[PDB]
Ligand binder design. Structure first.
Ligand SMILES: *Cc1c(COP(=O)(O)O)cnc(C)c1O
Ligand SMILES: *Cc1c(COP(=O)(O)O)cnc(C)c1O
Lengths: 359, 359
């Protein structure tokens, strides 16, 4: 292929897992690979990290897509199970699960399984998304230690809502609540994801759950990159030019003739659009690398194409290599220029994009 | 349980192709199915419309994937071919192609094919994206009529840049240029897509290329839906609740504490996020149907989850049906609320979303 392609550096992936073990030296690793491993490929990303202590996924479907591919490490269902009739599979597949509601707990109480299941009680410490609230947590917790269907001890998990904002006291407050509930309880503790790992060493505890930073991308919006933490970028969104055309001063480009040129120039057309996952919101001027040289996007990003300004005697030609982000272009730069989160940029890509794996 | 799923109404798809034949009664139909048929499924959308005169795709890959699935109809390569070594496949697969540059034409000229290929010369009439400029078009055109590898006559294609803006004279100008070049030439003429079909009956000519409106969605941003033109919505983006929790006044929700409740209420958590293709940009208040009942999104949309405000004694519960857009909730309405183009909303979805076909 020469069009929409994501190149995944397996070497950078391994480097990052090891680099994260250096940053959180007393904690085991839950490699978070939900949403097709953040756009890098669920199964391939797991196979690249046979050293991971466990893998984290959002849904049950993802966890078995892993077992189907031969992945054997423990897989953590971060949101738990959505149907009580799933417990038998989860037990047999040796999936570890979070438990945040009455339905899940009552399911565990009355299920009949050939083996007990390892569980992580999800505690709501401030995010107010999933989890048992503090005032209901002690009773809920106690019922889990009385389950013979639950492998003792009951582990405790939680998640930060604003760890990337060190100067609001949100994280210290969640930590305060997390610590109060865990006092005197056995079982592993886990509350830190990318942000908690890098900015809060007092939240590492027993297990940390690296997601975005595992792929060498930064968790915060302070324009820092994965390299700020010694992590190497894994993904490169690439394509090729399918046309190099003459253009003249005063002439508009794209839908809504929205960019107008102030000079005679040459425009390049890239085989990349939002039908591939590239943000339609990308404003003119956003950087793209053409033949390893940065050129600006001019005009509205279409479903399948993107126009760039090369210059009046630019000698680029149809077929030449284009990098949407990658080596000369961290996805974090593209997120600042487009105002789109790096999390969304690397993850919201379509099945039209080819996948390559190197090293 | 059910999670992220796109339900495709085959009946509505059929209705729209006919309805468009009623709006452009003297023109053949090029069903545009590029980018996985605008998120509806490339092969299934083609199989639902065996009545289409032809199918349009962005890339050669998409056309070949149609032939692989048993689609037998003529397929139009809207951007042409990117490599000269592709001509033999194009010829053998009976793919019709656009020709916009020197490389493609020179390729046609010196290739040796067992059969000639049907071609549509792409003329740049104002969009300044792809196509031969007016002052180079006559010479370029004449070389195509002299090709042994091109099945005569040479057809002429072009595309509108601002057909959804009837008040600016952009479309009349492109039409003026298109008409001047086609004078005295045989061969089919085609310049109209969804907008040209609905708003410009002078631009129908021989072939019209319905894309977005084929799926019952409006090409415009004037709070018009597909129903404004008698076209029925084909896609519904659905999911289910995975939690219904108590929440209290003054408490924030989601990442960044973006939302704070002014009352004790109950929050619902949807198994839908941008890891599925739902816009991360969706602001609190964006409508979502829970049990058929519109509720607002509260807090930032995460990779796998979305929180909604149900009410203090709302009786919704984990497992209940949620509609992100669909029947009751046109994708247009969501586009208006989120400020994201309906084109991108239905198209930029990930492979995590299941596909269902009804009728
Ligand atoms: C997805 C998620 C993570 C990883 O988050 P990052 O910000 O990419 O580090 C960890 N834990 C939970 C509970 C999550 O849902
Ligand atoms: C995608 C495309 C279409 C369809 O346009 P809509 O506005 O979605 O109908 C038709 N023709 C060409 C050249 C295209 O690239």
């Amino acid at each position: 292929m020469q069009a929409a392609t994501v190149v995944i550096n397996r070497r950078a992936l391994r480097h990052n897992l090891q680099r994260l073990r250096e940053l959180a030296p007393a904690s085991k690793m839950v490699a978070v690979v939900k949403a097709n491993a953040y756009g890098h490929g669920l199964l391939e990303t797991a196979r690249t990290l046979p050293d991971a202590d466990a893998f984290g996924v959002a849904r049950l479907e993802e966890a078995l897509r892993l077992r189907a591919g031969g992945i054997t490490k423990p897989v953590l269902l971060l949101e738990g199970f959505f149907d009580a009739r799933d417990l038998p599979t989860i037990s047999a597949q040796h999936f570890h699960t979070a438990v945040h509601n009455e339905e899940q707990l009552a399911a565990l109480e009355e299920a009949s399984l050939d083996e007990p299941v390892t569980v992580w009680m999800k505690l709501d410490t401030g995010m107010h998304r999933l989890g048992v609230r503090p005032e209901q947590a002690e009773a809920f917790y106690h019922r889990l230690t009385q389950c013979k269907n639950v492998r003792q001890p009951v582990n405790i998990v939680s998640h930060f809502a604003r760890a990337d904002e060190p100067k609001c006291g949100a994280t210290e407050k969640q930590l305060a609540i997390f610590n109060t509930f865990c006092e005197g309880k056995p079982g592993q503790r886990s509350i830190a994801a990318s942000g908690g790992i890098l900015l809060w060493p007092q939240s590492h505890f027993d297990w940390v759950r690296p997601g975005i930073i595992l792929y060498g991308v930064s968790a915060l919006e302070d324009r820092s990159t994965g390299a700020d933490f010694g992590c190497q970028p894994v993904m490169s969104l690439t394509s090729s030019l399918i046309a190099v055309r003459e253009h003249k001063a005063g002439e508009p480009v794209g839908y809504g003739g929205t960019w107008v040129s102030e000079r005679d120039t040459r425009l390049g057309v890239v085989a990349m659009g939002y039908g591939d996952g590239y943000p339609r919101a990308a404003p003119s001027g956003t950087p793209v690398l053409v033949n390893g040289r940065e050129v600006p996007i001019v005009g509205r990003v279409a479903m399948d194409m993107i126009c760039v300004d090369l210059g009046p005697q630019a000698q680029d030609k149809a077929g030449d290599p284009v990098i949407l982000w990658g080596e000369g272009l961290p996805v974090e730069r593209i997120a600042e220029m487009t105002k789109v989160s790096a999390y969304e940029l690397i993850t919201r890509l379509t099945s039209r994009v080819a996948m390559k794996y190197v090293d």
